[PDB]
Amino acid sequence: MAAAAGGPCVRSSRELWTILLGRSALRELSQIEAELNKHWRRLLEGLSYYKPPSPSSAEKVKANKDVASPLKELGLRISKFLGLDEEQSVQLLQCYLQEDYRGTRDSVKTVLQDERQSQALILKIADYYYEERTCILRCVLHLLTYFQDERHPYRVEYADCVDKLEKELVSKYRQQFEELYKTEAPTWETHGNLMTERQVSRWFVQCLREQSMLLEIIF
Amino acid sequence: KRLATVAPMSVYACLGNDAAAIRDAFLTRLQSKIEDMRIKVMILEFLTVAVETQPGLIELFLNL
């Protein structure tokens, strides 16, 4: 509702990275502070970030959105293709907000967009999905580099510490690499013709990017 | 903005209908996410010139 209203803006992983960006500083003070502080244990368990669909998730999805039919169709579709959970899938679609960005990024007038088309929209949703996955690892990597340069709040339980939790990150992220390597091929769960030349490369690019940042955190 | 002030011409015609609409939205969105003071000033600055430098861009602003 609020998201639909646009009053709230869901922080995309992309924005979260941008705030984290090495040059960035000023952005880091605000809403991000709340986000980083948030207890939600996505950081501790990265896998949960793009968890596979579950009936628990399905239930949450229904409860979460009762408000609108239309978004729902897309979210279900995307959740289906990648096999990501519905709630998360809803969030991905929810970056509907960034439509404006979408239009401008498109090519120069040799076309006056075919933006409205469902096919075009879905391709971009996949685009958004790839963007989010890649950015999330990106965020985590910078987030740690950030913390391990003096900053108490996020660390907390990590105050001039004992380093059990934090050490745990290494093995955990490490496990993720297998998945990243595994994405040699796209999920055949996805529909055909979605796989354009562009998608294939972006899919692959996501694979490398996730691996790179994951490696960086572990290092 | 600087172009418009010196230029007063129709940015909108050249920009195109859709691009202008999308752009204006960006300016509002510009203010929103990180609530930077600087970012807010920019939108105000851009819009102020647009209104003053005639109506072509201006009507678009209000209309969503």
mmCIF file of C-alpha atoms in Angstrom:
data_model
loop_
_atom_site.group_PDB
_atom_site.id
_atom_site.type_symbol
_atom_site.label_atom_id
_atom_site.label_comp_id
_atom_site.label_asym_id
_atom_site.label_seq_id
_atom_site.Cartn_x
_atom_site.Cartn_y
_atom_site.Cartn_z
ATOM 1 C CA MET A 1 0.000 0.000 0.000
ATOM 2 C CA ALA A 2 2.509 2.537 1.194
ATOM 3 C CA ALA A 3 4.941 1.137 -1.299
ATOM 4 C CA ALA A 4 2.272 1.371 -3.953
ATOM 5 C CA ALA A 5 1.559 4.878 -2.794
ATOM 6 C CA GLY A 6 5.212 5.543 -3.231
ATOM 7 C CA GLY A 7 5.394 7.226 0.101
ATOM 8 C CA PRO A 8 7.779 4.612 1.164
ATOM 9 C CA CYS A 9 10.536 3.643 -1.180
ATOM 10 C CA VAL A 10 11.819 0.153 -0.829
ATOM 11 C CA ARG A 11 15.514 0.186 -0.493
ATOM 12 C CA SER A 12 16.706 -1.951 -3.291
ATOM 13 C CA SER A 13 19.919 -3.829 -2.832
ATOM 14 C CA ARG A 14 21.173 -1.616 -5.590
ATOM 15 C CA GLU A 15 20.567 1.527 -3.598
ATOM 16 C CA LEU A 16 21.984 -0.105 -0.534
ATOM 17 C CA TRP A 17 25.163 -0.753 -2.420
ATOM 18 C CA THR A 18 25.299 2.749 -3.759
ATOM 19 C CA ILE A 19 25.077 4.135 -0.276
ATOM 20 C CA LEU A 20 27.930 1.815 0.748
ATOM 21 C CA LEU A 21 30.078 2.763 -2.296
ATOM 22 C CA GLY A 22 33.621 3.628 -1.376
ATOM 23 C CA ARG A 23 33.252 7.270 -2.198
ATOM 24 C CA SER A 24 29.879 7.418 -0.518
ATOM 25 C CA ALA A 25 29.647 8.623 3.047
ATOM 26 C CA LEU A 26 26.851 11.152 3.275
ATOM 27 C CA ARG A 27 24.262 8.781 1.892
ATOM 28 C CA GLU A 28 25.183 6.353 4.626
ATOM 29 C CA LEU A 29 23.678 8.613 7.225
ATOM 30 C CA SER A 30 19.881 8.245 7.254
ATOM 31 C CA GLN A 31 17.382 5.550 6.269
ATOM 32 C CA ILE A 32 20.270 3.269 5.510
ATOM 33 C CA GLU A 33 21.181 3.489 9.138
ATOM 34 C CA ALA A 34 17.833 2.005 9.976
ATOM 35 C CA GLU A 35 18.228 -0.622 7.298
ATOM 36 C CA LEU A 36 21.650 -1.727 8.442
ATOM 37 C CA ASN A 37 20.481 -1.780 12.024
ATOM 38 C CA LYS A 38 17.557 -3.995 11.071
ATOM 39 C CA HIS A 39 17.615 -7.304 12.875
ATOM 40 C CA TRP A 40 16.485 -9.236 9.807
ATOM 41 C CA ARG A 41 19.154 -11.849 9.437
ATOM 42 C CA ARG A 42 19.720 -11.674 5.733
ATOM 43 C CA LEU A 43 23.360 -10.832 6.293
ATOM 44 C CA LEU A 44 24.013 -13.740 8.579
ATOM 45 C CA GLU A 45 22.412 -16.075 6.125
ATOM 46 C CA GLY A 46 22.834 -14.936 2.537
ATOM 47 C CA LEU A 47 21.015 -17.949 1.183
ATOM 48 C CA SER A 48 17.818 -16.783 2.776
ATOM 49 C CA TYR A 49 18.007 -13.598 0.782
ATOM 50 C CA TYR A 50 16.937 -15.382 -2.398
ATOM 51 C CA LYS A 51 15.347 -18.356 -0.753
ATOM 52 C CA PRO A 52 13.447 -20.853 -2.749
ATOM 53 C CA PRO A 53 9.712 -20.805 -2.631
ATOM 54 C CA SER A 54 8.083 -22.443 0.332
ATOM 55 C CA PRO A 55 4.564 -22.845 1.466
ATOM 56 C CA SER A 56 5.491 -20.670 4.397
ATOM 57 C CA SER A 57 6.573 -18.048 1.919
ATOM 58 C CA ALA A 58 3.459 -18.556 -0.124
ATOM 59 C CA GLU A 59 1.354 -17.971 2.939
ATOM 60 C CA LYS A 60 3.276 -14.857 3.793
ATOM 61 C CA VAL A 61 2.881 -13.665 0.258
ATOM 62 C CA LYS A 62 -0.858 -13.991 0.475
ATOM 63 C CA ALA A 63 -1.018 -12.258 3.813
ATOM 64 C CA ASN A 64 1.419 -9.607 2.737
ATOM 65 C CA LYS A 65 -0.487 -8.667 -0.344
ATOM 66 C CA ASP A 66 -4.223 -8.733 -0.291
ATOM 67 C CA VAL A 67 -4.222 -5.263 -1.787
ATOM 68 C CA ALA A 68 -3.759 -5.730 -5.491
ATOM 69 C CA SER A 69 -4.262 -8.328 -8.175
ATOM 70 C CA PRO A 70 -2.006 -7.048 -10.983
ATOM 71 C CA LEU A 71 1.344 -6.922 -9.316
ATOM 72 C CA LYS A 72 0.647 -10.360 -8.037
ATOM 73 C CA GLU A 73 0.607 -11.965 -11.443
ATOM 74 C CA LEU A 74 4.085 -10.776 -12.279
ATOM 75 C CA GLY A 75 5.490 -11.706 -8.906
ATOM 76 C CA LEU A 76 4.158 -15.204 -9.228
ATOM 77 C CA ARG A 77 5.551 -15.476 -12.720
ATOM 78 C CA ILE A 78 9.038 -14.390 -11.754
ATOM 79 C CA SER A 79 9.008 -16.471 -8.613
ATOM 80 C CA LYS A 80 8.211 -19.359 -10.920
ATOM 81 C CA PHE A 81 10.926 -18.800 -13.472
ATOM 82 C CA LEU A 82 13.874 -18.397 -11.174
ATOM 83 C CA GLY A 83 12.286 -20.367 -8.412
ATOM 84 C CA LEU A 84 12.910 -17.585 -5.915
ATOM 85 C CA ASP A 85 10.311 -17.297 -3.160
ATOM 86 C CA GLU A 86 7.144 -15.336 -3.805
ATOM 87 C CA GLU A 87 7.568 -12.818 -1.047
ATOM 88 C CA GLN A 88 10.951 -11.883 -2.297
ATOM 89 C CA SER A 89 9.737 -12.059 -5.846
ATOM 90 C CA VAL A 90 7.080 -9.567 -4.882
ATOM 91 C CA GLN A 91 9.781 -7.298 -3.552
ATOM 92 C CA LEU A 92 11.702 -7.560 -6.792
ATOM 93 C CA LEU A 93 8.662 -6.615 -8.809
ATOM 94 C CA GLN A 94 8.031 -3.956 -6.237
ATOM 95 C CA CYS A 95 10.989 -2.144 -7.700
ATOM 96 C CA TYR A 96 8.193 -1.093 -10.087
ATOM 97 C CA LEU A 97 8.900 2.157 -8.400
ATOM 98 C CA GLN A 98 11.987 2.604 -10.540
ATOM 99 C CA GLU A 99 10.016 2.778 -13.776
ATOM 100 C CA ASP A 100 11.394 6.227 -14.570
ATOM 101 C CA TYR A 101 14.910 4.900 -14.471
ATOM 102 C CA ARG A 102 13.844 2.176 -16.834
ATOM 103 C CA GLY A 103 12.517 4.492 -19.505
ATOM 104 C CA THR A 104 15.523 6.768 -19.620
ATOM 105 C CA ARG A 105 18.031 3.948 -19.640
ATOM 106 C CA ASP A 106 16.371 2.596 -22.753
ATOM 107 C CA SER A 107 17.934 3.287 -26.130
ATOM 108 C CA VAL A 108 17.947 6.526 -28.091
ATOM 109 C CA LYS A 109 14.998 7.357 -30.263
ATOM 110 C CA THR A 110 15.215 4.773 -32.970
ATOM 111 C CA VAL A 111 12.220 3.461 -31.172
ATOM 112 C CA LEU A 112 9.682 5.197 -29.004
ATOM 113 C CA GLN A 113 9.824 2.314 -26.511
ATOM 114 C CA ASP A 114 7.743 -0.829 -26.379
ATOM 115 C CA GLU A 115 7.971 -0.445 -22.638
ATOM 116 C CA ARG A 116 4.347 -1.246 -21.938
ATOM 117 C CA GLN A 117 4.554 -4.688 -23.481
ATOM 118 C CA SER A 118 4.384 -7.503 -20.979
ATOM 119 C CA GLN A 119 7.341 -9.225 -22.533
ATOM 120 C CA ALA A 120 9.438 -6.118 -22.225
ATOM 121 C CA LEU A 121 8.379 -5.614 -18.647
ATOM 122 C CA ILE A 122 9.228 -9.160 -17.641
ATOM 123 C CA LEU A 123 12.609 -9.020 -19.270
ATOM 124 C CA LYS A 124 13.291 -6.019 -17.132
ATOM 125 C CA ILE A 125 11.945 -7.765 -14.063
ATOM 126 C CA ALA A 126 14.513 -10.482 -14.659
ATOM 127 C CA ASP A 127 16.880 -7.571 -15.150
ATOM 128 C CA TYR A 128 15.871 -6.221 -11.792
ATOM 129 C CA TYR A 129 16.325 -9.624 -10.248
ATOM 130 C CA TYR A 130 19.822 -9.992 -11.596
ATOM 131 C CA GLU A 131 20.575 -6.488 -10.512
ATOM 132 C CA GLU A 132 19.402 -7.205 -6.990
ATOM 133 C CA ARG A 133 21.270 -10.466 -6.590
ATOM 134 C CA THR A 134 24.491 -9.016 -7.772
ATOM 135 C CA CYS A 135 24.083 -5.908 -5.659
ATOM 136 C CA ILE A 136 23.274 -7.813 -2.492
ATOM 137 C CA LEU A 137 26.614 -9.580 -2.366
ATOM 138 C CA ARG A 138 28.162 -6.294 -3.341
ATOM 139 C CA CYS A 139 26.496 -4.685 -0.371
ATOM 140 C CA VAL A 140 27.614 -7.348 2.051
ATOM 141 C CA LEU A 141 31.187 -7.132 0.882
ATOM 142 C CA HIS A 142 31.389 -3.398 1.335
ATOM 143 C CA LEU A 143 29.423 -3.631 4.499
ATOM 144 C CA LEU A 144 32.103 -5.781 6.120
ATOM 145 C CA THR A 145 34.939 -3.697 4.795
ATOM 146 C CA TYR A 146 33.071 -0.781 6.232
ATOM 147 C CA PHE A 147 32.664 -2.372 9.636
ATOM 148 C CA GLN A 148 36.165 -3.653 9.899
ATOM 149 C CA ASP A 149 37.242 -0.041 9.805
ATOM 150 C CA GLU A 150 35.796 0.900 13.185
ATOM 151 C CA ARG A 151 32.026 1.127 13.729
ATOM 152 C CA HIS A 152 30.345 -0.364 16.736
ATOM 153 C CA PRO A 153 26.594 -0.373 16.013
ATOM 154 C CA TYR A 154 26.286 -3.024 13.337
ATOM 155 C CA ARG A 155 28.906 -5.194 14.934
ATOM 156 C CA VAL A 156 27.052 -5.264 18.242
ATOM 157 C CA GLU A 157 27.564 -8.519 19.943
ATOM 158 C CA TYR A 158 30.711 -7.400 18.311
ATOM 159 C CA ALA A 159 32.065 -4.841 20.705
ATOM 160 C CA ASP A 160 35.881 -5.105 21.300
ATOM 161 C CA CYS A 161 35.174 -8.734 21.055
ATOM 162 C CA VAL A 162 35.419 -12.395 20.953
ATOM 163 C CA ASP A 163 35.180 -13.233 17.330
ATOM 164 C CA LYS A 164 32.997 -16.284 17.070
ATOM 165 C CA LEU A 165 30.101 -14.963 15.031
ATOM 166 C CA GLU A 166 32.134 -12.958 12.637
ATOM 167 C CA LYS A 167 34.556 -15.759 11.936
ATOM 168 C CA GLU A 168 31.559 -17.830 10.921
ATOM 169 C CA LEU A 169 31.007 -15.607 7.909
ATOM 170 C CA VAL A 170 33.987 -17.082 6.102
ATOM 171 C CA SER A 171 32.740 -20.623 5.841
ATOM 172 C CA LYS A 172 29.209 -19.540 5.174
ATOM 173 C CA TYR A 173 29.918 -17.252 2.255
ATOM 174 C CA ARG A 174 32.415 -19.786 1.042
ATOM 175 C CA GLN A 175 29.648 -22.347 0.609
ATOM 176 C CA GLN A 176 27.812 -19.894 -1.610
ATOM 177 C CA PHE A 177 30.523 -20.113 -4.233
ATOM 178 C CA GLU A 178 29.345 -23.545 -5.250
ATOM 179 C CA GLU A 179 25.993 -22.079 -6.182
ATOM 180 C CA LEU A 180 27.643 -19.259 -8.052
ATOM 181 C CA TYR A 181 29.839 -21.653 -9.979
ATOM 182 C CA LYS A 182 26.839 -23.868 -10.580
ATOM 183 C CA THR A 183 25.063 -21.156 -12.479
ATOM 184 C CA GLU A 184 26.941 -22.187 -15.596
ATOM 185 C CA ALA A 185 23.565 -22.615 -17.158
ATOM 186 C CA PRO A 186 20.427 -20.718 -16.606
ATOM 187 C CA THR A 187 17.599 -22.370 -14.786
ATOM 188 C CA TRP A 188 15.580 -24.215 -17.346
ATOM 189 C CA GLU A 189 12.710 -23.310 -15.106
ATOM 190 C CA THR A 190 12.600 -20.099 -17.067
ATOM 191 C CA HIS A 191 10.623 -19.757 -20.252
ATOM 192 C CA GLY A 192 12.293 -19.660 -23.601
ATOM 193 C CA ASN A 193 12.932 -16.542 -25.648
ATOM 194 C CA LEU A 194 13.437 -14.857 -22.343
ATOM 195 C CA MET A 195 16.953 -15.951 -22.931
ATOM 196 C CA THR A 196 18.163 -13.236 -25.200
ATOM 197 C CA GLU A 197 21.772 -12.595 -25.952
ATOM 198 C CA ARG A 198 21.523 -9.796 -23.454
ATOM 199 C CA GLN A 199 20.064 -11.941 -20.727
ATOM 200 C CA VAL A 200 22.620 -14.661 -21.133
ATOM 201 C CA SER A 201 25.467 -12.265 -20.642
ATOM 202 C CA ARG A 202 23.860 -10.448 -17.761
ATOM 203 C CA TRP A 203 23.065 -13.770 -16.140
ATOM 204 C CA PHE A 204 26.659 -14.843 -16.493
ATOM 205 C CA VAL A 205 27.911 -11.456 -15.335
ATOM 206 C CA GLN A 206 25.839 -11.818 -12.201
ATOM 207 C CA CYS A 207 27.536 -15.139 -11.586
ATOM 208 C CA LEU A 208 30.991 -13.663 -11.700
ATOM 209 C CA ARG A 209 30.012 -10.629 -9.709
ATOM 210 C CA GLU A 210 28.537 -12.651 -6.907
ATOM 211 C CA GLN A 211 31.628 -14.801 -6.785
ATOM 212 C CA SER A 212 33.953 -11.827 -6.743
ATOM 213 C CA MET A 213 32.352 -9.983 -3.844
ATOM 214 C CA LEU A 214 31.821 -13.174 -1.894
ATOM 215 C CA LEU A 215 35.513 -13.904 -2.324
ATOM 216 C CA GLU A 216 36.385 -10.430 -1.199
ATOM 217 C CA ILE A 217 34.444 -10.769 1.998
ATOM 218 C CA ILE A 218 36.034 -14.091 2.748
ATOM 219 C CA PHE A 219 39.491 -12.711 2.086
ATOM 220 C CA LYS B 1 18.869 24.686 -15.732
ATOM 221 C CA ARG B 2 21.707 26.831 -16.867
ATOM 222 C CA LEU B 3 20.879 26.048 -20.443
ATOM 223 C CA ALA B 4 17.239 26.908 -19.954
ATOM 224 C CA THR B 5 17.914 30.198 -18.293
ATOM 225 C CA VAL B 6 20.237 31.451 -20.980
ATOM 226 C CA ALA B 7 18.434 29.549 -23.736
ATOM 227 C CA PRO B 8 14.725 30.009 -23.063
ATOM 228 C CA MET B 9 13.497 27.669 -25.722
ATOM 229 C CA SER B 10 11.496 24.496 -25.777
ATOM 230 C CA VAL B 11 13.435 21.767 -24.054
ATOM 231 C CA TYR B 12 10.316 19.656 -24.087
ATOM 232 C CA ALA B 13 9.872 19.503 -27.805
ATOM 233 C CA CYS B 14 13.393 18.286 -28.315
ATOM 234 C CA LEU B 15 13.349 15.975 -25.306
ATOM 235 C CA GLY B 16 10.213 14.306 -26.494
ATOM 236 C CA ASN B 17 6.967 13.751 -24.674
ATOM 237 C CA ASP B 18 7.880 10.573 -22.856
ATOM 238 C CA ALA B 19 11.409 11.491 -21.955
ATOM 239 C CA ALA B 20 10.303 14.719 -20.377
ATOM 240 C CA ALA B 21 7.655 13.027 -18.316
ATOM 241 C CA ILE B 22 10.065 10.396 -17.106
ATOM 242 C CA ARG B 23 12.696 13.037 -16.345
ATOM 243 C CA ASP B 24 10.390 15.191 -14.257
ATOM 244 C CA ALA B 25 9.479 12.193 -12.191
ATOM 245 C CA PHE B 26 13.160 11.676 -11.619
ATOM 246 C CA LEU B 27 13.474 15.107 -10.111
ATOM 247 C CA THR B 28 10.796 14.312 -7.580
ATOM 248 C CA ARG B 29 12.340 10.911 -6.924
ATOM 249 C CA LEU B 30 15.635 12.724 -6.683
ATOM 250 C CA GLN B 31 14.514 14.340 -3.450
ATOM 251 C CA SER B 32 13.013 11.186 -1.951
ATOM 252 C CA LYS B 33 15.394 8.330 -1.225
ATOM 253 C CA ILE B 34 18.390 9.755 0.542
ATOM 254 C CA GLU B 35 16.833 13.039 1.596
ATOM 255 C CA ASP B 36 20.002 14.885 0.755
ATOM 256 C CA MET B 37 19.741 18.621 1.203
ATOM 257 C CA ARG B 38 21.788 19.148 -1.918
ATOM 258 C CA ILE B 39 19.558 16.968 -3.997
ATOM 259 C CA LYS B 40 16.475 18.835 -2.842
ATOM 260 C CA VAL B 41 17.985 22.170 -3.732
ATOM 261 C CA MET B 42 18.649 20.964 -7.241
ATOM 262 C CA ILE B 43 15.080 20.020 -7.928
ATOM 263 C CA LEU B 44 13.879 23.338 -6.612
ATOM 264 C CA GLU B 45 16.458 25.104 -8.725
ATOM 265 C CA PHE B 46 15.558 23.243 -11.877
ATOM 266 C CA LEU B 47 11.830 23.697 -11.513
ATOM 267 C CA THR B 48 12.088 27.323 -10.568
ATOM 268 C CA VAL B 49 13.856 28.180 -13.788
ATOM 269 C CA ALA B 50 11.478 26.092 -15.803
ATOM 270 C CA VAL B 51 8.439 27.894 -14.510
ATOM 271 C CA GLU B 52 9.999 31.268 -15.069
ATOM 272 C CA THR B 53 11.370 30.414 -18.444
ATOM 273 C CA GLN B 54 7.922 29.858 -19.827
ATOM 274 C CA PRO B 55 5.296 27.257 -19.928
ATOM 275 C CA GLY B 56 6.508 24.485 -22.193
ATOM 276 C CA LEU B 57 8.140 22.362 -19.509
ATOM 277 C CA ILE B 58 5.995 23.806 -16.752
ATOM 278 C CA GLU B 59 2.671 22.240 -17.594
ATOM 279 C CA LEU B 60 4.315 18.859 -17.681
ATOM 280 C CA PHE B 61 5.503 19.201 -14.112
ATOM 281 C CA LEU B 62 2.079 19.302 -12.574
ATOM 282 C CA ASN B 63 0.705 16.623 -14.793
ATOM 283 C CA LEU B 64 1.525 13.086 -13.840
#
